[PDB]
Amino acid sequence: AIPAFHPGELNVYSAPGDVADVSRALRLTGRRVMLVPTMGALHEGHLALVRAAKRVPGSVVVVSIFVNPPDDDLAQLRAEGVEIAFTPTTAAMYPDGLRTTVQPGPLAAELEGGPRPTHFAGVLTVVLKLLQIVRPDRVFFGEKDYQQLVLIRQLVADFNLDVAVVGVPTVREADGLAMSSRNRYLDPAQRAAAVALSAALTAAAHAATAGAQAALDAARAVLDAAPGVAVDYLELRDIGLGPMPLNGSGRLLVAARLGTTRLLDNIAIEIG
Amino acid sequence: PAFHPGELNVYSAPGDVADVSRALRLTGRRVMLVPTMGALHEGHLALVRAAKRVPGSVVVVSIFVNPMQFGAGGDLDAYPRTPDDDLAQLRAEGVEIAFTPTTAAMYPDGLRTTVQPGPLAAELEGGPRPTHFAGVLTVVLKLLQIVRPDRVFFGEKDYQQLVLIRQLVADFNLDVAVVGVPTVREADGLAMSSRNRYLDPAQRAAAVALSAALTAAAHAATAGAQAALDAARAVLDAAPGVAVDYLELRDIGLGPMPLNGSGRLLVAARLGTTRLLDNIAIEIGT
Numbered sequence A: 001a002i003p004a005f006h007p008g009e010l011n012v013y014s015a016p017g018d019v020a021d022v023s024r025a026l027r028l029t030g031r032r033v034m035l036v037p038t039m040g041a042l043h044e045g046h047l048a049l050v051r052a053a054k055r056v057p058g059s060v061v062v063v064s065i066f067v068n069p070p071d072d073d074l075a076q077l078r079a080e081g082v083e084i085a086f087t088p089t090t091a092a093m094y095p096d097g098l099r100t101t102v103q104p105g106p107l108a109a110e111l112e113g114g115p116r117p118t119h120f121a122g123v124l125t126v127v128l129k130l131l132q133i134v135r136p137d138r139v140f141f142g143e144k145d146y147q148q149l150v151l152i153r154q155l156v157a158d159f160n161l162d163v164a165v166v167g168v169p170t171v172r173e174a175d176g177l178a179m180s181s182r183n184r185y186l187d188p189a190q191r192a193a194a195v196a197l198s199a200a201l202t203a204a205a206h207a208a209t210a211g212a213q214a215a216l217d218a219a220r221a222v223l224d225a226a227p228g229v230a231v232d233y234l235e236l237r238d239i240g241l242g243p244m245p246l247n248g249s250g251r252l253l254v255a256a257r258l259g260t261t262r263l264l265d266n267i268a269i270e271i272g
Numbered sequence B: 001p002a003f004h005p006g007e008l009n010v011y012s013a014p015g016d017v018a019d020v021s022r023a024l025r026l027t028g029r030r031v032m033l034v035p036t037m038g039a040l041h042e043g044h045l046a047l048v049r050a051a052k053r054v055p056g057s058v059v060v061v062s063i064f065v066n067p068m069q070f071g072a073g074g075d076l077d078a079y080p081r082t083p084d085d086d087l088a089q090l091r092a093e094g095v096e097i098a099f100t101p102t103t104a105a106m107y108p109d110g111l112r113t114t115v116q117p118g119p120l121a122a123e124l125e126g127g128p129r130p131t132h133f134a135g136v137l138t139v140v141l142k143l144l145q146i147v148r149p150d151r152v153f154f155g156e157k158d159y160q161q162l163v164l165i166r167q168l169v170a171d172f173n174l175d176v177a178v179v180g181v182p183t184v185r186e187a188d189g190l191a192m193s194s195r196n197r198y199l200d201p202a203q204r205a206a207a208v209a210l211s212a213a214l215t216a217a218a219h220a221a222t223a224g225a226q227a228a229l230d231a232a233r234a235v236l237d238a239a240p241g242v243a244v245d246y247l248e249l250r251d252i253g254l255g256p257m258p259l260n261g262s263g264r265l266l267v268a269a270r271l272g273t274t275r276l277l278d279n280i281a282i283e284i285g286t
């Protein structure tokens, strides 16, 4: 017997089998299941994934909230008209502990995989589990974590997963700072300097009519004008994060530490 | 693309079989998957027959040999490859779908994202071949995603592989039932295996000791674990030209749990260059 589901209300499930049963039952009645994976502490950047999933016709939106090893989140989801929240415990997700896992390809060792070399094996493992529990038609990730998003597209391709991955543009504060729960830690001087990441990327994207080296030098000049911004990398790559082609489309990515807080941003770049 | 029911439909492209499987499920057939490396014998046919008997079933048998569960030199080029006979046998069994993908369609990006099995993959068969089961589980996960069966069928013969596939299914929340099928044996007890063709007549005679050792241990086991193991060892020791790689009695999940009342006894041995495996359920003090 299918667990209880009330159309038009926020239905909260903690057991993986429950959300699985509901989602199978809902898909059979002709709803298209949209999955929006999060770690809770919801802000406007997360709600833009939610809004994107909501506008697919016939959608029922599943928002998962899970931290790799609350009332207000759920209120935000209600206010958004989300009908399902999936809130599993660690034990529900890892009942046999850490056993079979996904091993990413070599892209996971680069860029964010520098400081955190097993970070993405962990992310891909839980993404794959969520896809299998929920079996959505489409799954939504923010472009803010671009390398994560490209890794998910590789997971999907490589394991023949039948789900469409939708990347959602980065939501920004008024001065361009990419929204993130970490921003709250920045003191005023760090918060003022943090604008340099987005300002450097946008400067680079306009300078790119003059070519790839003009785009990189414009970005570096902007970051060089900020105090207390320790750049960990600034790299222009093609859109799948391979090496940047001579011309055409790419992606410019930056990560920097301001005090103890690490910030990331990236932007589409059209070369020449 | 096309699906002619009651006939064998062969697809090579993953998209084709995924499309047909999905259409079939939607019309309410239940999809059964039997993964093979081809070279089909009666052991594979027991899997097929178990799949066939699930009411409403449509049976997909896949045939695919890696470049990932093999680990050089060496072996990958050594695998028996008769696709011909295989399809004929499947037609005979009334299978409706054979899935025979190319290496290119399975690995268009080489080895990029893969499955990392848990620590069981480093033991037993994995001892000398510590990448072998990452190869197997990566293909089985892809087959499960392409075909999305209701049930997938594996033989008990490759018991460690069966356990690993159950771990993969649990650990990734895969929505498929794994059905283990009992080992099919020649009349003298020898477990059927495509590798048995590499035994010359003397080695074929000697190879009965694996199954004789195991069944002797299963009966001996009223006298305890040590008696069962020594009975198996004695039989294997009496066998000319059988060289034992391992003989081990484990818990049923092969797992990090001590042995209690129920066990599996596993053996691997070389007869010249041919490596043979077998295993049996063991009840201690029963």
Ligand SMILES: Nc1ncnc2c1ncn2[C@@H]1O[C@H](COP(=O)(O)OP(=O)(O)OP(=O)(O)O)[C@@H](O)[C@H]1O
Binding pocket: A037, A038, A039, A040, A044, A045, A046, A048, A049, A140, A141, A142, A143, A144, A145, A168, A169, A170, A171, A172, A178, A179, A180, A181, A182, A183
């Ligand atoms: N500003 C943003 N715009 C678009 N998507 C975002 C934004 N911030 C987070 N996301 C997306 O939300 C999903 C959940 O992200 P997660 O729950 O880590 O939050 P986060 O803001 O990146 O928090 P943290 O600062 O702790 O890293 C991911 O797909 C992520 O890329």
Ligand SMILES: Nc1ncnc2c1ncn2[C@@H]1O[C@H](COP(=O)(O)OP(=O)(O)OP(=O)(O)O)[C@@H](O)[C@H]1O
Binding pocket: B035, B036, B037, B038, B042, B043, B044, B046, B047, B153, B154, B155, B156, B157, B158, B181, B182, B183, B184, B185, B191, B192, B193, B194, B195, B196
């Ligand atoms: N004798 C048997 N009884 C039941 N199942 C079997 C038997 N032999 C193989 N199988 C199963 O058939 C499936 C396909 O196996 P595969 O194509 O490796 O054949 P194989 O006979 O084991 O070949 P090889 O001898 O080359 O290892 C696996 O699930 C395997 O456990």
Ligand SMILES: CN(C)S(=O)(=O)c1ccsc1
Binding pocket: A037, A038, A039, A064, A066, A067, A068, A122, A123, A126, A127, A130
């Ligand atoms: C990508 N994440 C937001 S996720 O829900 O799949 C996750 C990853 C590690 S914890 C939660």
Ligand SMILES: CN(C)S(=O)(=O)c1ccsc1
Binding pocket: A189, A191, A192, A193, A194, A195, A196, A199, A222, A223, A225, A226, A227
């Ligand atoms: C102090 N920072 C606000 S800053 O104005 O000096 C800065 C920010 C990005 S470049 C210079």
Ligand SMILES: CN(C)S(=O)(=O)c1ccsc1
Binding pocket: B035, B036, B037, B062, B064, B065, B066, B069, B135, B136, B139, B140, B143
């Ligand atoms: C377990 N196999 C028979 S499979 O079809 O998943 C496979 C694995 C490596 S080659 C074929």
Ligand SMILES: [Mg+2]
Binding pocket: A145
């Ligand atoms: Mg984040």
Ligand SMILES: [Mg+2]
Binding pocket: B158
């Ligand atoms: Mg085999």
